[PDB]
Amino acid sequence: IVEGSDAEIGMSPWQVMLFRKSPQELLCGASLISDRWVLTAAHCLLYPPWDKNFTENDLLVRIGKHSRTRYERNIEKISMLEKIYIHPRYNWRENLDRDIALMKLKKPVAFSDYIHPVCLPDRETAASLLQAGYKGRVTGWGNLKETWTANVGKGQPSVLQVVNLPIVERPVCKDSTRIRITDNMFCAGYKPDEGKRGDACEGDAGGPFVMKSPFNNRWYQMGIVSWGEGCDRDGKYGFYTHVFRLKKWIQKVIDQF
Protein backbone atom coordinates (compact mmCIF):
# COMPACT_ATOMS: atom_id res chain seq x y z
CA ILE A 1 0.00 0.00 0.00
CA VAL A 2 1.24 3.45 -1.02
CA GLU A 3 0.93 6.47 1.30
CA GLY A 4 -0.74 4.72 4.25
CA SER A 5 -0.33 4.55 8.02
CA ASP A 6 0.51 1.47 10.08
CA ALA A 7 -2.79 -0.26 10.94
CA GLU A 8 -4.04 -0.46 14.53
CA ILE A 9 -4.56 -3.81 16.28
CA GLY A 10 -7.95 -5.22 15.21
CA MET A 11 -8.59 -2.26 12.92
CA SER A 12 -9.26 -4.62 10.00
CA PRO A 13 -10.01 -8.00 11.64
CA TRP A 14 -11.39 -9.53 8.42
CA GLN A 15 -8.04 -9.12 6.64
CA VAL A 16 -6.52 -12.39 5.38
CA MET A 17 -3.04 -13.24 4.12
CA LEU A 18 -2.99 -15.60 1.16
CA PHE A 19 0.22 -17.60 1.40
CA ARG A 20 2.10 -20.03 -0.85
CA LYS A 21 3.45 -23.34 0.47
CA SER A 22 6.10 -24.38 -2.08
CA PRO A 23 7.91 -22.09 -1.67
CA GLN A 24 7.07 -19.92 1.38
CA GLU A 25 5.67 -16.67 -0.06
CA LEU A 26 2.93 -14.08 0.42
CA LEU A 27 0.81 -14.08 -2.74
CA CYS A 28 -2.18 -11.82 -2.09
CA GLY A 29 -4.58 -10.27 0.40
CA ALA A 30 -8.12 -11.52 1.08
CA SER A 31 -11.12 -11.04 3.38
CA LEU A 32 -13.11 -13.07 5.91
CA ILE A 33 -16.86 -13.07 5.12
CA SER A 34 -17.99 -15.99 7.31
CA ASP A 35 -16.30 -18.71 9.40
CA ARG A 36 -15.99 -21.13 6.45
CA TRP A 37 -15.33 -18.68 3.60
CA VAL A 38 -12.70 -16.25 2.30
CA LEU A 39 -13.16 -13.63 -0.44
CA THR A 40 -10.22 -13.01 -2.82
CA ALA A 41 -9.28 -11.94 -6.37
CA ALA A 42 -9.37 -14.61 -9.09
CA HIS A 43 -6.06 -13.57 -10.71
CA CYS A 44 -4.33 -14.34 -7.39
CA LEU A 45 -5.13 -18.02 -8.00
CA LEU A 46 -5.38 -18.21 -11.80
CA TYR A 47 -3.20 -16.47 -14.39
CA PRO A 48 -2.37 -18.46 -17.58
CA PRO A 49 0.01 -15.92 -19.23
CA TRP A 50 2.44 -16.58 -16.36
CA ASP A 51 1.38 -20.25 -16.04
CA LYS A 52 -0.21 -19.55 -12.65
CA ASN A 53 -2.76 -22.05 -11.30
CA PHE A 54 -3.05 -22.98 -7.64
CA THR A 55 -4.79 -25.90 -5.95
CA GLU A 56 -5.94 -26.28 -2.33
CA ASN A 57 -2.76 -27.96 -1.04
CA ASP A 58 -0.54 -25.25 -2.56
CA LEU A 59 -2.11 -22.34 -0.68
CA LEU A 60 -2.59 -21.34 2.94
CA VAL A 61 -4.60 -18.55 4.61
CA ARG A 62 -3.69 -16.53 7.72
CA ILE A 63 -6.27 -14.41 9.55
CA GLY A 64 -5.82 -12.07 12.54
CA LYS A 65 -2.38 -10.86 11.47
CA HIS A 66 -0.72 -7.50 12.11
CA SER A 67 3.06 -7.87 11.69
CA ARG A 68 5.14 -9.82 9.13
CA THR A 69 8.61 -9.91 10.69
CA ARG A 70 6.75 -11.88 13.39
CA TYR A 71 4.77 -15.11 13.71
CA GLU A 72 2.04 -14.03 16.14
CA ARG A 73 1.38 -16.91 18.56
CA ASN A 74 -2.17 -17.38 19.93
CA ILE A 75 -3.28 -14.37 17.85
CA GLU A 76 -3.17 -15.54 14.23
CA LYS A 77 -5.00 -18.68 13.16
CA ILE A 78 -3.94 -20.55 10.03
CA SER A 79 -6.64 -22.30 8.01
CA MET A 80 -6.25 -24.99 5.36
CA LEU A 81 -8.26 -24.85 2.13
CA GLU A 82 -11.00 -27.29 1.14
CA LYS A 83 -12.16 -26.06 -2.29
CA ILE A 84 -11.57 -23.16 -4.73
CA TYR A 85 -14.33 -21.43 -6.72
CA ILE A 86 -13.38 -19.05 -9.54
CA HIS A 87 -15.92 -17.15 -11.68
CA PRO A 88 -16.40 -18.97 -15.05
CA ARG A 89 -16.60 -15.68 -16.99
CA TYR A 90 -13.39 -14.33 -15.40
CA ASN A 91 -11.48 -12.57 -18.18
CA TRP A 92 -7.73 -12.83 -17.65
CA ARG A 93 -7.08 -11.94 -21.30
CA GLU A 94 -7.87 -8.22 -21.33
CA ASN A 95 -9.35 -6.39 -18.32
CA LEU A 96 -9.80 -8.87 -15.47
CA ASP A 97 -13.59 -8.82 -15.77
CA ARG A 98 -15.14 -10.73 -12.86
CA ASP A 99 -11.79 -10.96 -11.06
CA ILE A 100 -13.30 -12.79 -8.09
CA ALA A 101 -12.68 -16.09 -6.32
CA LEU A 102 -14.06 -17.82 -3.21
CA MET A 103 -12.25 -20.24 -0.89
CA LYS A 104 -13.89 -22.61 1.57
CA LEU A 105 -11.70 -23.36 4.59
CA LYS A 106 -11.25 -27.00 5.67
CA LYS A 107 -12.17 -26.15 9.28
CA PRO A 108 -14.20 -23.21 10.60
CA VAL A 109 -12.37 -20.29 12.21
CA ALA A 110 -13.14 -19.23 15.79
CA PHE A 111 -13.82 -15.50 16.11
CA SER A 112 -11.80 -13.35 18.49
CA ASP A 113 -10.68 -9.71 18.90
CA TYR A 114 -8.44 -10.13 15.83
CA ILE A 115 -10.62 -12.41 13.67
CA HIS A 116 -14.07 -11.19 12.59
CA PRO A 117 -16.03 -11.31 9.28
CA VAL A 118 -17.04 -8.29 7.16
CA CYS A 119 -20.56 -7.60 5.82
CA LEU A 120 -21.46 -8.00 2.18
CA PRO A 121 -23.77 -5.31 0.80
CA ASP A 122 -27.24 -5.68 -0.69
CA ARG A 123 -29.12 -3.24 -2.96
CA GLU A 124 -30.03 -0.51 -0.44
CA THR A 125 -26.58 -0.44 1.21
CA ALA A 126 -24.87 -0.38 -2.21
CA ALA A 127 -27.02 2.56 -3.33
CA SER A 128 -26.20 4.66 -0.25
CA LEU A 129 -22.46 3.83 -0.11
CA LEU A 130 -21.15 3.53 -3.69
CA GLN A 131 -20.90 7.20 -4.72
CA ALA A 132 -18.01 9.18 -6.22
CA GLY A 133 -16.35 11.38 -3.59
CA TYR A 134 -17.17 8.85 -0.85
CA LYS A 135 -14.07 7.40 0.79
CA GLY A 136 -13.40 3.69 1.31
CA ARG A 137 -10.50 1.78 2.88
CA VAL A 138 -7.93 -0.62 1.40
CA THR A 139 -5.70 -2.94 3.44
CA GLY A 140 -2.60 -5.02 2.71
CA TRP A 141 1.03 -5.98 3.26
CA GLY A 142 1.99 -5.14 -0.33
CA ASN A 143 4.74 -2.86 -1.66
CA LEU A 144 4.89 0.76 -0.46
CA LYS A 145 6.01 2.21 -3.81
CA GLU A 146 5.60 1.32 -7.50
CA THR A 147 7.67 -1.75 -8.45
CA TRP A 148 9.56 -2.19 -11.72
CA THR A 149 8.31 -5.68 -12.57
CA ALA A 150 4.77 -6.98 -12.13
CA ASN A 151 4.75 -8.60 -8.66
CA VAL A 152 5.83 -8.68 -4.99
CA GLY A 153 9.44 -7.75 -4.28
CA LYS A 154 11.58 -5.47 -2.12
CA GLY A 155 9.81 -2.52 -0.49
CA GLN A 156 7.52 -4.37 1.92
CA PRO A 157 6.20 -3.00 5.23
CA SER A 158 6.78 -4.91 8.49
CA VAL A 159 3.16 -4.27 9.52
CA LEU A 160 -0.26 -4.24 7.82
CA GLN A 161 -0.94 -0.86 6.18
CA VAL A 162 -4.12 1.17 5.71
CA VAL A 163 -5.16 3.82 3.15
CA ASN A 164 -8.40 5.71 2.50
CA LEU A 165 -9.42 6.35 -1.11
CA PRO A 166 -12.26 8.28 -2.78
CA ILE A 167 -14.54 6.49 -5.25
CA VAL A 168 -14.22 7.99 -8.74
CA GLU A 169 -16.82 8.83 -11.41
CA ARG A 170 -17.15 6.28 -14.25
CA PRO A 171 -16.14 8.65 -17.11
CA VAL A 172 -12.86 9.54 -15.35
CA CYS A 173 -12.24 5.81 -14.69
CA LYS A 174 -12.64 5.17 -18.42
CA ASP A 175 -10.59 8.18 -19.57
CA SER A 176 -7.73 7.17 -17.25
CA THR A 177 -6.91 3.99 -19.18
CA ARG A 178 -6.91 2.59 -22.72
CA ILE A 179 -7.89 -0.78 -21.20
CA ARG A 180 -11.58 -1.53 -21.83
CA ILE A 181 -13.39 -1.30 -18.49
CA THR A 182 -16.60 -3.13 -17.54
CA ASP A 183 -19.47 -2.58 -15.10
CA ASN A 184 -18.32 -5.41 -12.81
CA MET A 185 -15.54 -3.11 -11.60
CA PHE A 186 -15.19 0.41 -10.19
CA CYS A 187 -12.20 2.73 -9.73
CA ALA A 188 -10.88 4.58 -6.69
CA GLY A 189 -8.22 7.12 -5.69
CA TYR A 190 -7.42 10.83 -5.67
CA LYS A 191 -7.26 13.08 -8.76
CA PRO A 192 -4.22 15.14 -9.87
CA ASP A 193 -6.27 18.19 -8.82
CA GLU A 194 -6.77 16.90 -5.24
CA GLY A 195 -3.23 16.75 -3.79
CA LYS A 196 -3.62 13.76 -1.51
CA ARG A 197 -1.95 10.47 -2.39
CA GLY A 198 -2.51 6.74 -1.97
CA ASP A 199 -2.96 3.55 -3.96
CA ALA A 200 -2.91 -0.22 -3.61
CA CYS A 201 0.23 -1.86 -4.98
CA GLU A 202 1.70 -5.33 -5.56
CA GLY A 203 0.78 -7.92 -2.92
CA ASP A 204 -2.42 -6.07 -2.02
CA ALA A 205 -4.53 -7.75 -4.72
CA GLY A 206 -7.38 -9.79 -3.23
CA GLY A 207 -7.67 -7.62 -0.11
CA PRO A 208 -10.87 -5.74 0.75
CA PHE A 209 -12.07 -2.25 -0.12
CA VAL A 210 -14.37 -1.43 2.76
CA MET A 211 -16.77 1.33 3.81
CA LYS A 212 -18.51 2.05 7.10
CA SER A 213 -22.25 2.71 6.96
CA PRO A 214 -22.88 6.08 8.67
CA PHE A 215 -26.28 4.84 9.85
CA ASN A 216 -25.93 1.28 11.16
CA ASN A 217 -22.19 1.41 12.11
CA ARG A 218 -21.34 -1.81 10.22
CA TRP A 219 -18.38 -2.24 7.86
CA TYR A 220 -19.29 -3.36 4.33
CA GLN A 221 -16.91 -4.66 1.68
CA MET A 222 -17.72 -2.87 -1.58
CA GLY A 223 -14.56 -3.84 -3.48
CA ILE A 224 -11.70 -6.27 -4.01
CA VAL A 225 -8.20 -5.11 -4.95
CA SER A 226 -8.05 -6.11 -8.61
CA TRP A 227 -5.83 -4.07 -10.93
CA GLY A 228 -4.24 -0.76 -11.89
CA GLU A 229 -1.54 0.70 -14.10
CA GLY A 230 1.57 1.31 -12.01
CA CYS A 231 1.00 2.37 -8.40
CA ASP A 232 -0.16 5.87 -7.33
CA ARG A 233 0.43 7.44 -10.77
CA ASP A 234 -1.08 10.86 -11.47
CA GLY A 235 -4.25 10.38 -13.54
CA LYS A 236 -4.34 6.66 -12.76
CA TYR A 237 -6.78 4.95 -10.40
CA GLY A 238 -6.89 1.50 -8.84
CA PHE A 239 -9.72 -0.67 -10.13
CA TYR A 240 -11.73 -2.78 -7.72
CA THR A 241 -13.99 -5.70 -8.51
CA HIS A 242 -17.57 -4.49 -7.91
CA VAL A 243 -18.63 -6.84 -5.08
CA PHE A 244 -22.38 -6.17 -5.27
CA ARG A 245 -22.71 -6.94 -9.01
CA LEU A 246 -21.24 -10.35 -8.13
CA LYS A 247 -23.24 -10.95 -4.95
CA LYS A 248 -25.52 -13.14 -7.07
CA TRP A 249 -22.62 -15.48 -7.89
CA ILE A 250 -21.38 -15.50 -4.26
CA GLN A 251 -24.87 -16.27 -2.92
CA LYS A 252 -24.97 -19.23 -5.33
CA VAL A 253 -21.60 -20.72 -4.27
CA ILE A 254 -22.02 -20.40 -0.48
CA ASP A 255 -25.57 -21.83 -0.57
CA GLN A 256 -24.52 -24.72 -2.85
CA PHE A 257 -21.13 -25.35 -1.16
Binding site: S5, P13, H116, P117, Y134, K135, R218, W219
Partner: peptide
Protein backbone atom coordinates in the same frame (compact mmCIF):
# COMPACT_ATOMS: atom_id res chain seq x y z
CA UNK B 1 -27.64 -9.35 9.67
CA UNK B 2 -25.18 -11.36 11.82
CA UNK B 3 -22.27 -9.97 13.89
CA UNK B 4 -20.57 -8.78 10.68
CA UNK B 5 -18.91 -5.37 10.19
CA UNK B 6 -18.79 -4.48 13.90
CA UNK B 7 -15.31 -4.70 15.40
CA UNK B 8 -14.73 -6.15 18.90
CA UNK B 9 -11.86 -3.77 19.71
CA UNK B 10 -13.68 -0.72 18.29
CA UNK B 11 -17.45 -0.75 17.55
CA UNK B 12 -18.17 -3.13 20.45
CA UNK B 13 -16.18 -0.89 22.81
CA UNK B 14 -17.55 2.42 21.42
CA UNK B 15 -14.06 3.39 20.17
CA UNK B 16 -12.80 5.01 16.96
CA UNK B 17 -9.61 4.25 15.02
CA UNK B 18 -7.27 7.07 13.95
CA UNK B 19 -8.38 7.38 10.31
CA UNK B 20 -12.14 6.66 10.29
CA UNK B 21 -13.20 10.31 10.84
CA UNK B 22 -11.77 10.88 7.32
CA UNK B 23 -14.17 8.28 5.87
CA UNK B 24 -17.21 9.77 7.63
CA UNK B 25 -16.26 13.29 6.53
CA UNK B 26 -16.68 12.00 2.95
CA UNK B 27 -20.44 11.76 3.58
CA UNK B 28 -20.43 15.54 4.27
CA UNK B 29 -17.34 17.09 2.63
Amino acid sequence: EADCGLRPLFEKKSLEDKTERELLESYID
